[model samples]
Target: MQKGRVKWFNAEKGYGFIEREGDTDVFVHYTAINAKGFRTLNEGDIVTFDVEPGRNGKGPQAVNVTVVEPARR
Candidate 1:
């Protein structure tokens, strides 16, 4: 799993991108991330996820996601 932050999470669209330093973000849907009731994907939390081929023209997409909070201090 790679450490990636919550980028532009299009809550209205029900889709978002996984952010990774020096790397391109990946597409992620609400179904892919299950932290709680689909109120939101917790944008404050950075996640570690396993990415696989999206099978589309774009790169890979997030498959498995683990929610974790990084150091604030």
Candidate 2:
């Protein structure tokens, strides 16, 4: 899985984009979200997900999205 941040998200649309470290953004859908605490998508939330290749050499699609708040304890 690749680590990234929620660069943008639309709760009404239930879709968003993830900005991976040192790379372009990846499209992410609500259906791809997982994890107990990840009930909703929000901008700036830390996440890890599988990278799905887009067609025609486009940017990657973020699949199997899972949220992981940093263990700040």
Candidate 3:
């Protein structure tokens, strides 16, 4: 898994971006978040995720996402 911080999340749209250290930001969709609770994330939330080539080949997409701190409030 790759580590990164949540750049922003759009609850209404259910998508966001995660900024990885020394790398381009990865696309993160709410569906990609792994959890039993609400599938949402907050800005600056530290997380880890798997990198996969985006379905559209636009850029890196974050999958199997997990929040590592504050437990998704």
Candidate 4:
């Protein structure tokens, strides 16, 4: 497992990248989120997740993704 902050995520498009706290950024898809109902990550939200090999043009992906806290507006 790894930790990082969400760089940006498109809830509608269902994907985005994580700014690794300390791989290169990770690509994340909505489906990999470990939660029920709708799952969307916000920029600057701290999180921990696991990485897996991505397919095709996709780069590293974050799975079992979790949000430790919500972003403050």
Candidate 5:
């Protein structure tokens, strides 16, 4: 798993993107989050996830996401 911050999240769209620790932003759909009763995966939240191939190998999506506040510097 790698640590990253959500680059953008749209509550209405029910989708978002996460900028990984050392990778491009990943596309996260509602279905992926709805299962966990998450309405919206907010932005700027420190999260960790596993990298997995997306629908067409474009980028990555966060699998088994764990949301946490930004670490105290």
Candidate 6:
């Protein structure tokens, strides 16, 4: 799995971007997260995920996403 920080998240849209160190940001959809219902990811949250070449000729996307460090309060 690759480690990265959540670059931004839009709860209403249920999608986000993960900032991979020394690499490009990966797109993350809420559906790809490993969580129960209503998962809410925040910016700066640390996470681990598998990356796959995106479909529809898009960039890389993060899958099997799991939060490693929740955003500090």
Candidates in order, TM-scores: namely 0.71, 0.78, 0.85, 0.85, 0.70, 0.87
Give model 6's clash tally: 0
Please provide, for model 6 over 1-73, each residue's C-alpha lDDT reduced to its tens digit, 9 standing for 90 to 100: 7999999999899988989889988999888899643397899898889998766233589889998888885
Q: List the residue pairs that clash in candidate 4.
A: none
Mark the regions of model 2 whose C-alpha exceeds 4 Å error after superposition: 54-58, 70-73
lDDT against the true structure, each candidate: 0.70, 0.77, 0.83, 0.82, 0.68, 0.85
| Per-residue accuracy of model 5 over 1-73 as CA lDDT, tens digit each | 5777878778887777888656688877655652444446777867766767667353676667766664333
In model 3, pairs of residues that clash are: none
Put down candidate 3 lDDT per residue, 1-73, tens digits, no spaces: 6899998888888988889889998999888999756579888788889997767353689999998873353
Write down the RMSD of candidate 3 (Cα, Å): 2.4
Q: Write the per-residue lDDT of candidate 2 for residues 1-73, one digit (tens) a residue.
A: 6998887788898888888778888988787888666656788888888987654243678778888763232
Give lDDT tens digits, candidate 4, residues 1-73: 7889988998889898889756588988988888843389888878889987767256788889988876774
Deviation from native of the Cα of residue 61 in model 6, angstroms = 0.3
Question: Over all chains combined, what TM-score does candidate 5 have?
Answer: 0.70
Better of 1 and 3 by lDDT: 3
Q: What is the Å distance of residue 26 in model 4 from its true position?
A: 0.1
**Full candidate order by TM-score, most accurate first:** 6, 4, 3, 2, 1, 5
Q: For this target, which candidate reaches the highest lDDT against the unseen true structure?
A: 6
Superposed by TM-score, candidate 5 places the C-alpha of residue 54 at a distance from the truth, in angstroms, of 2.5
Clashing pairs in 5: none
- Of 1 and 4, the candidate ahead on TM-score is 4
lDDT of 6 at 61: 92
Provide the lowest-lDDT 10-residue window in model 3: 51-60
